[PDB]
Design a protein around this ligand. Sequence first.
Ligand SMILES: *[C@@H]1O[C@H](CO)[C@@H](O[C@@H]2O[C@H](CO)[C@@H](O)[C@H](O)[C@H]2NC(C)=O)[C@H](O)[C@H]1NC(C)=O
Ligand SMILES: *[C@@H]1O[C@H](CO)[C@@H](O)[C@H](O)[C@H]1NC(C)=O
Ligand SMILES: *[C@@H]1O[C@H](CO)[C@@H](O)[C@H](O)[C@H]1NC(C)=O
Ligand SMILES: *[C@@H]1O[C@H](CO)[C@@H](O)[C@H](O)[C@H]1NC(C)=O
Ligand SMILES: *[C@@H]1O[C@H](CO)[C@@H](O)[C@H](O)[C@H]1NC(C)=O
Ligand SMILES: *[C@@H]1O[C@H](CO)[C@@H](O)[C@H](O)[C@H]1NC(C)=O
Lengths: 48, 96, 595, 48, 48, 27
Amino acid sequence: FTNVYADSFVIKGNEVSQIAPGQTGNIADYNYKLPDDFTGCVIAWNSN
Amino acid sequence: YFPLQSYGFRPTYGVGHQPYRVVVLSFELLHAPATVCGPKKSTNLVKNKCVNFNFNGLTGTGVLTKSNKKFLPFQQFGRDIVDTTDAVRDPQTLEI
Amino acid sequence: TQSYTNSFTRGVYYPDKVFRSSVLHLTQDLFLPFFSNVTWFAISGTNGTKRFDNPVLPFNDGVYFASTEKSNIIRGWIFGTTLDSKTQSLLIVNNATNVFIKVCEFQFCNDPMESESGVYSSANNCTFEYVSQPFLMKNLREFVFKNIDGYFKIYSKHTPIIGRDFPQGFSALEPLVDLPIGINITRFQTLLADYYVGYLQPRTFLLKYNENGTITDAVDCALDPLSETKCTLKSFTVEKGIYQTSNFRVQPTESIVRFPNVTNLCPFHEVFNATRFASVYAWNRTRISNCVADYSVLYNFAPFFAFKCYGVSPTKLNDLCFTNVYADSFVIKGNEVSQIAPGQTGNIADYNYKLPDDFTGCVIAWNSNKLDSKHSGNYDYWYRSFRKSKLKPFERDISTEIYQYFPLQSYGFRPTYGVGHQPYRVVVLSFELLHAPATVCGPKKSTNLVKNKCVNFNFNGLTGTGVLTKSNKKFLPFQQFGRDIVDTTDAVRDPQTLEILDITPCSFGGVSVITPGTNTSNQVAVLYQGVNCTEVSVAIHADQLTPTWRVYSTGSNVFQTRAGCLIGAEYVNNSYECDIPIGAGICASYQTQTK
Amino acid sequence: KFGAISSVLNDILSRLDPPEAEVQIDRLITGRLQSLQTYVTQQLIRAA
Amino acid sequence: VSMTKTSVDCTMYICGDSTECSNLLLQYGSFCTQLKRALTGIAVEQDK
Amino acid sequence: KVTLICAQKFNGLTVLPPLLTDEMIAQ
Ligand SMILES: *[C@@H]1O[C@H](CO)[C@@H](O[C@@H]2O[C@H](CO)[C@@H](O)[C@H](O)[C@H]2NC(C)=O)[C@H](O)[C@H]1NC(C)=O
Ligand SMILES: *[C@@H]1O[C@H](CO)[C@@H](O)[C@H](O)[C@H]1NC(C)=O
Ligand SMILES: *[C@@H]1O[C@H](CO)[C@@H](O)[C@H](O)[C@H]1NC(C)=O
Ligand SMILES: *[C@@H]1O[C@H](CO)[C@@H](O)[C@H](O)[C@H]1NC(C)=O
Ligand SMILES: *[C@@H]1O[C@H](CO)[C@@H](O)[C@H](O)[C@H]1NC(C)=O
Ligand SMILES: *[C@@H]1O[C@H](CO)[C@@H](O)[C@H](O)[C@H]1NC(C)=O
């Protein structure tokens, strides 16, 4: 890899499926957007 | 209108509302130009034979020989008239 | 802005990490254009030899910097946005032992006789520090500063020029350092205690590599028709002949938007903010017509659970025109929101409501629990567990039959259920789009109608480029559009005046370059194919012609042929054998004339 | 249309975001490029 | 003896006045160049 | 017997004139 970056945050479980390339919604538009030409991984773990 | 909301969640909410920790790892891949690489056991360098090779993520098959090309200290790869890879720099010895 | 000079064959850098040998590589990157203007800074510009401050310069898609210097008066650069400590900035400084590059939330304090001092004493919330051998070391000290894909790329070259302050030779800059910062860098300033600043633009260059991995020459493909020819052939030597290298088009000068002068707003308020909602099995269908389809109101009414469009983008609904805005208003369980979509399988798609697969429209869902969730609940609910057969698209069965089992259930939901069971109000907007035949259109500010010019136009959602003229076509009152033998739109009716306008395509054609050969002369002629010389001259004067280069185009060197307009050759009445063919009996040749 | 929602590129770009438009545009590009290849091949045969 | 000499602007046929389409077209390599040379060769042949 | 505005087929398709005109062929 040339640019391993790590974005660390906590979200509601129902938003986990929304953080992905090409998604539409309130998190994609107002909190954080991913590019569509996205190489990487999204890892989610319940932190309750 | 106050756009930002700071609300903690109770353990009694449905799991769709409970917090999850999420890490997004952004991996730009640009044809093996860098030092970050997954764990692999390095082997010896074998020249003048047809071998498989993995050079910093660059995967291929060929015969490796001593190069007489004059690369600048910056340059790591060589290509011919048809954009086919024809030279590499060894990541441990910096041999071309 | 003390003075302006021209860069000459300078600012080329190695675009990548690939070694190349004895090749000509045609590449697109951000480069300083050849013979472009550069601002020459008259030590320190506004500042003198030793004065309080100097202005901040723009950083437009990368900057070329150069300065022939032995005293090392220029010892650094700052990159940033506000440069007032409210935004992070990047400081590169050289102490002649090491170069220190840092990114912190810096405050500019007018940091620069017989005095030296530390700079940028306020440096809060520092996040990045890098140290290396000095960047600086008669010596040009050329640098290119580029900031793309997060990385701040610094390239440099040092040359031994004794007799010239700005050398006329050629060299390529080598990469010096490439840092993973991720900073905007809208503007920058040079730190002193003479120099040239140029700016990079997207350009295509043909780069000549030596036997070794070095660049010895380059040609800027957009500088002149000869360079364009060289790039087309990928050679620095061009043989005698005529070559087709590019096409030309006349660009629109202005844009016009014409929609019916309708002031009625679409009743999105009543549909979304409804007192009562339809049951699940029997959605309430209304029709929206003869109104302005302003969709910002939906975002003003509530934050949404989901706003997912299938045939359109949610951003662009206010630009499009619609023929059949229909609104289906109903309340469902949250877990069913994801099931109302084209192509879905399940109990709601099959027994309550089906969408077509060729669906243009939007599905908007909003949790309604604040109004609809009660211990008794809202008894508008009527879900259909069983239906004798699958429901057709847009079909609604109001009547209820008992299966030989009671298919319909009326249950209110308590506020204590998981959100997947709580009610959500959902509105489905069906948008049939049929090439702009209708009065419903998003809010847009109408402009004047501009005729006899190449313009962009938007006619009731029909988008295009062309020249609009008075039409002599006899349309019936019903007919709104005209098409030719090949189903290309060639006529519209103005939505406000009902005037019939013809659409003529804007001038376009090939460009050929007539070259005597580079072993004789670098003078070339340009043929614009299939166009009148008057139209070309007007396009040049208006700065509408797509290619950015211009031929001198003075009196008596512009000649009209059947092939096209020939600019850069003097027509004579002395015939000769054909040399370089042009067409229709006309040939060109490089000859000795008058002396 | 060659499988696209519309034969007109201006309508695809007016209606869809780049990530969906690229799919519809690639369907139109494939169809137009094959049409040009057919034309050029038959012009070469006629030229012979 | 001769055939009508034609010329085709490949980009303007496939991707007329569309930058997004042109950029997608670039991923197919030099097809427009091969077609352009073929039609130029035909055009020259007819005058020959 | 056998039958510069690009009025028809203005979709990037142009027609180039012959090098020799009908008059030159007649000559
Ligand atoms: C490429 O680099 C080499 C080494 O820096 C240059 O030097 C010459 O290399 C050839 C190789 O066969 C020798 O025979 C010469 O004697 C070298 N000259 C000197 C002065 O050392 C070479 O000139 C470079 N290539 C070009 C085209 O300049
Ligand atoms: C560049 O600076 C301007 C200063 O007004 C700022 O508005 C802009 O957002 C900056 N660029 C980026 C990419 O943020
Ligand atoms: C626009 O206003 C003019 C005013 O004379 C009117 O004649 C015309 O009918 C209006 N257009 C529409 C679409 O109503
Ligand atoms: C819109 O919502 C508000 C909420 O306070 C309500 O008072 C108003 O009556 C609603 N409008 C309609 C048409 O129901
Ligand atoms: C259904 O839509 C019609 C449209 O005229 C409206 O009058 C009626 O009140 C609506 N009913 C419900 C329950 O939304
Ligand atoms: C160019 O336009 C003028 C009128 O503006 C006309 O007289 C002339 O014949 C035209 N030339 C060609 C080649 O069409």
